[PDB]
Structures are given as C-alpha cells and as structure tokens.
Design a protein around this ligand. Structure first.
Ligand SMILES: *[C@]1(C(=O)O)O[C@@H]([C@H](O)[C@H](O)CNC(=O)c2ccccc2)[C@H](NC(C)=O)[C@@H](O)[C@H]1F
Ligand SMILES: [Cl-]
Length: 626
C-alpha cells in the first residue's frame, strides 16, 4: 500500500546526508549523521517540533548519540536544525537515548537515559554503573524576522532525576529506567506524565507511571506496574484515566488503564488490550508506537500506529495507522510506502492537519521521513461521520412506550444490517465485515440455506489485529430471526465459536426438529427448551460476562439460562461468531433462516436495554438510509 491520495512525504532527517551542529570541546562543527531514529513530532504553541536520535557513526543503539531537533513555522515547508541535548562525551559511545517528549506551554520537557561507555543494550546491564536519567527543557519563542514570523528554542542544561528513583519497588530491587520514547502527556490536572520502562536486578522489564505535580522539579512513581515483559509504554488520557499501551516483544500488546496516576493498573481486556499483534503470528519483536488522543470534528478519539512486520525480526515493515473511539477500532491504512522497513513513528494532528514522522530503514541506515496524511485524515473524518450518524440515528429512535428508553449505543461495536455485497455482510461501523455463503439479501439482513450456508464475523480470525478480542471477556450479540424449515435434527442459528469449525462453542443458539430451542453453554450437554413456530419472527440475545452465558428469546431468558461457559481459569479464544449457519460446507447441518440487524456490544446489556432492543427491532435497520 502507500499514503492515501492527496498525501505525500519527504526525507526530513536524511541518513548520511543531513548535518547537525555537533559540539565538542567548546567547539561546534556541522557534522553529518549516519542515522536518525526515535521520532517525536509535537506542536508547541504553533511551532512544529521534531525530536529524534542523532546517531553519528552507526545505527547501533550503543554508540555516539545526541538528541537532534528541527522546527518549523510553515508546517514543514522549512526547518531549523539544532542539538537539544548533547551526551557526556565521556567515551566514543557516550549517548543520550530514547528521548520522550511532553509539551506544556511553550515548553518541551525531554527525558532521555544517559550512558557513558557501555556497548551493551541497557536491559542486559546488571547494575546502573553506566546509567543516568536526565530531563532537559527547551523553551519556545516566536517572533518576526524579515516581516515574516520566526521562532527559536533555547535548550536548558539537562538535570539528573536519579534522586527520584527508589532503590526498591514492591518485591524488587531497581536497576535503571528510561522514558517510553515518542510523545508523553500533561494530565488534565496539570501533571507531567511519563510512562517509563524500568528494569530490576533480575533484569526484568516492566512499565510504570513517572509523574510531576510541580512543573518538573520533583517526580514520583505510581505505586503500581504492568506485568513483566512490557516495554516502551506510550500513554494517553481518556475519560479521566490513563490508557497505557505497551510493547511486548514476541507477544500481543498489553494495554492498561489507571485512574489514580499509576497506583493501580487494570488490563483493558474489554477494549484495547491484546488487540494489536507485533507480527502476523505475534511471535516477533514489537515496536515503539504513537498513541494520542485528539478531538476531530467535536469527537474525541485515539490514533495508534505500529508496523505489521511481515518480514519478521526487527525489519518491521508496513507502518499502519489505527483509529478508535475506545469501542470500534478502524484500520485507516498503511502510512509507510510499499514494503519498506518502517518501525518507530510519531503522528501529529495540528490545525486540522495530520502529519507523521517515521523511520525508513535500508541495511540498518535510518532516516525519518515527514508525511502529510491528507487522504488519511479524509478517511478518518468520514468514518467518524459514520459512527456519529449511526449513533445519532439509533439514539433518536422513539422506542415503543410517548417513547420508552432510547436504544443504547454505549458499547455498540458492530452492526450487520441492510448493506451486503455478494460475499460480505457489511459492518455499518465500517470496521469488520462478515463473510457469507448461500445468502440472499433481504431488507436489513440476509436469508440463508444449504449445507455450508451462513455468515462468519471473525474474532480470532481477524488475524494479527483482533478488534473483537474484548468478546473473550464480555459481549452481547443481538439478532432478529425467522426459521423457514423445521430441521432434520438440530441446526445452528447464532453463536460464538471457540474453533474454526463452529463445533467447539462458547455460547450458542440452535433449534431442533421438535420445535424447541437448543441453547448451548460451552461443552455442557444440551437440553432443548421452549418452543417456536416455523415462519415466525423472533428476537435473540446472547450475553456473556463473568464466565456466564445467557440466551433470551423475545426479550426473556430461556429456562435454565445463565450457565458457566468458561470452565477453568484460561481465557477464551473465540474464533468467530456464526450467524444463520456455520458457513462451513463441512458441517452437515442446513439452516434455512433469515437473520436481520445483528448487533455486537462489548459488555453484557442489562434487562432494560435488552427489553428496548426487542420492542424496537423493527425500527433500527439501516435500510432506509442505505
Ligand atoms: C528500539 C527498536 O526496537 O528498534 O529498541 C529499543 C530497545 O533496544 C528495545 O526495547 C530492547 N532491545 C532488546 O530487547 C534487544 C536489543 C538488541 C538485541 C536483542 C534484543 C531501543 N532503545 C534502547 C534504549 O536501546 C530503541 O532505540 C530502538 F532501537
Ligand atoms: Cl530484583
């Protein structure tokens, strides 16, 4: 893929070409840089600022590095270059590393680890003999040169914050810590907040919250932490909580939420945790990620980037952009070009303009290109228009009492309704479509029939990035159904499957030749219950929360519903939801049924919300508006 139409870029920090003002021995010389890495792009009072690593001689992490900075007043049309922080010059490999930036006022708060002579990766160090943690502040000043506007950043001498690092943390002895790289934040209470990666004497890595209530003079660590294995954390604030997105090498990315500045950390199992995989099989090294909360056209949202890493190891090709409102998760597309190597990145939203500063690597020689995400922001605005519209549409429906409670759109992730192509049932939220077989389009839905007939809404089948991972912890699946033929035995209607066939179910609804419902609770022996008549329309709700599954028909629980569907302590790994058959020609069954308006929620709905959905089933369809 490549940049969306209308978008373009330029190699801003050009490898082995761009020069910087390297200072040594009171002298200063324009020195060429082999590699530029660790991109951090921010907006300071109108000034666009780009911070990064200046790796003078090699791209090897443990070499000579200073923190470079280029700034613009014309939004990337022209840039001034400087060195924001120079390393100790103690050896040929002295360096200030992984700059992490926070903008507050006309101030740049830059946190970097500092090493003097070690040629070993920081996480392999057994002690802090070679380490320090420094904070440098750059103050921005705008003015006018030849009639036109100009600016200048004055950089302060870095200050050691090592005095704020406790020798002990709950059950361990501290070693070193660094910022999470990229861009950090100012909390809504004013606090400077840096998600930091810390090591202990057992050489384990884990993330913590390192914050300041006094503009940067003193610092504290939240009492809590992530699990071990969580590095380069990146955080944002969302609805009064910090959402900390972590890199986990060779594993799916863990995401945590903290309401108390890091004293307690809860994994975001019902929203973003384990959604993003570091590679197709999530068995390769991860990456630093841009993760920010922006307000586009009135709507608060989060932007996330990470490479797909098809190539493997650290190559990390295909830098992708994601959009989420903490409910739906949309893949905006690929920001890097073709299959170039593009790991670390930084996305900025400034004056309704979207930009990205990210790495491009060829033979371990890095450059930072500066891209104008024009087509991308177009797509983003459009998708948000779609979410706002469908939410407004559903919320404005006057439900049967003059009106009863409004249809709930809180936690509504996907909706399969009128729109369907020959092979796909389309998500009105435009994030995840369902694949189909033997389906005939009908108002607000599809009519199925035949061995192999049905629809498949992927969960673990989505692949590397699993937007419906939350379903393994809780969900509500809703649908209107009509059975056209009494089955020979027991046929599937709606369900959450644990395997690819649909034979190993988590929670499901089947119907049998004796006109009874067959709710399936995990691998528990089935017991038919209730009755139905052929050709009659029914309303079905499947919910799961607290390892318990329930099945409702026409708004009411079936007898004996509410059983444990998650047997032990291992978390489910739902493969997909099946609707109107298994969509597997390999399953014998034949479901002749019509299913309309399938809704997917990331929580268990309550009795009233279930009641309103039932009464309102003929009002929610997308049909009239396409
Ligand atoms: C990124 C990167 O992946 O490109 O990595 C971090 C850091 O090195 C990484 O989180 C940890 N490294 C390893 O686990 C490892 C390194 C080498 C060989 C095997 C394992 C860099 N930051 C630091 C402080 O090293 C960052 O600059 C960048 F290289
Ligand atoms: Cl320890």
């Amino acid at each position: 893929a490549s940049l969306a139409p209308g978008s373009s870029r330029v190699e801003l920090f050009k490898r082995q070409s761009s020069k910087v003002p390297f200072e040594k021995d009171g002298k200063v010389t324009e020195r060429v840089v082999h590699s530029f890495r660790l991109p951090a792009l921010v907006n300071v009072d109108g000034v666009m600022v780009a911070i990064a690593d200046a790796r003078y001689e090699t791209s090897f992490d443990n070499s000579l590095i200073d923190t470079v900075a280029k700034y613009s007043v014309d939004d990337g049309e022209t840039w001034e270059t400087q060195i924001a922080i120079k390393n100790s010059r103690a050896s040929s490999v002295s360096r200030v590393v992984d700059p992490t930036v926070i903008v507050k006022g006309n101030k740049l708060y830059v946190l970097v680890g500092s090493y003097n002579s070690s040629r070993s990766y920081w996480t392999s160090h057994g002690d802090a003999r070679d380490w320090d943690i420094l904070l440098a502040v750059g103050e921005v000043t705008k003015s006018t040169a030849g009639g036109k506007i100009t600016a200048s950043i004055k950089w302060g001498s870095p200050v050691s914050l090592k005095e704020f690092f406790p020798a002990e943390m709950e059950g361990m002895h501290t070693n070193q810590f660094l910022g999470g790289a990229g861009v950090a934040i100012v909390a809504s209470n004013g606090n400077l907040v840096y998600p930091v990666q810390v090591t202990n004497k057992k050489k384990q890595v884990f993330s913590k919250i390192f914050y300041s209530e006094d503009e940067g003079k003193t610092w504290k660590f939240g009492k809590g932490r992530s699990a071990f294995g969580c590095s380069e954390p990146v955080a944002l604030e969302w609805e009064g909580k910090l959402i900390i997105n972590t890199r986990v090498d060779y594993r799916r990315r863990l995401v945590y939420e903290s309401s108390d500045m890091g004293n307690t950390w809860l994994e975001a199992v019902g929203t973003l945790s384990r959604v993003w995989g570091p590679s197709p099989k999530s068995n390769q090294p991860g990456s630093q990620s841009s993760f920010t909360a922006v307000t586009i056209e009135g709507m608060r949202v989060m932007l996330f980037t990470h490479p797909l890493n098809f190539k493997g190891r650290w190559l990390r090709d295909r830098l992708n952009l994601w959009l989420t409102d903490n409910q739906r998760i949309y893949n905006v597309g690929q920001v890097s070009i073709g299959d170039e190597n593009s790991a670390y990145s930084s996305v900025l939203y400034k004056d309704d303009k979207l930009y990205c500063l990210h790495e491009i690597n060829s033979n371990e020689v890095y450059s930072l290109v500066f891209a104008r995400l024009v087509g991308e922001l177009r797509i983003i605005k459009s998708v948000l228009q779609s979410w706002k519209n469908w939410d407004s549409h559903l919320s404005s429906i006057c439900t049967p009492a003059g009106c009863g409670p409004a249809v709930t759109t809180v936690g509504l992730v996907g909706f399969l309704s009128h729109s369907a192509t020959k092979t796909e049932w389309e998500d009105a939220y435009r994030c995840v479509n369902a694949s189909t077989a033997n389906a005939e389009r009908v108002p607000n839905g599809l009519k199925f029939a035949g061995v192999g007939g049905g629809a498949l809404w992927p969960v673990s089948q989505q692949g590397q990035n699993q937007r419906y991972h939350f379903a393994n912890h809780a969900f509500t699946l809703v649908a209107s159904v009509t059975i056209h033929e009494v089955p020979k035995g027991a046929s599937p209607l709606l369900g959450a499957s644990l395997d690819s066939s649909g034979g190993k179910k988590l929670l499901g609804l089947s119907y049998d030749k004796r006109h009874q419902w067959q709710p399936i609770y995990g691998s528990t022996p089935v017991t038919p219950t209730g009755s139905w008549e052929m050709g009659k329309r029914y309303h079905v709700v499947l919910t799961m929360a607290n390892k318990i599954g329930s099945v409702y028909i026409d708004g009411e629980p079936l007898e004996g519903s509410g059983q444990t569907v998650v047997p032990d302590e291992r978390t489910p790994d739902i493969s997909h939801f099946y609707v109107g058959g298994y969509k597997r020609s390999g399953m014998p069954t034949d479901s002749r049924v019509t299913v309309n308006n399938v809704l997917l929620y990331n929580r268990q709905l309550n009795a009233e919300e279930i009641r309103t959905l039932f009464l309102s089933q003929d009002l929610i369809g997308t049909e009239a508006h396409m």
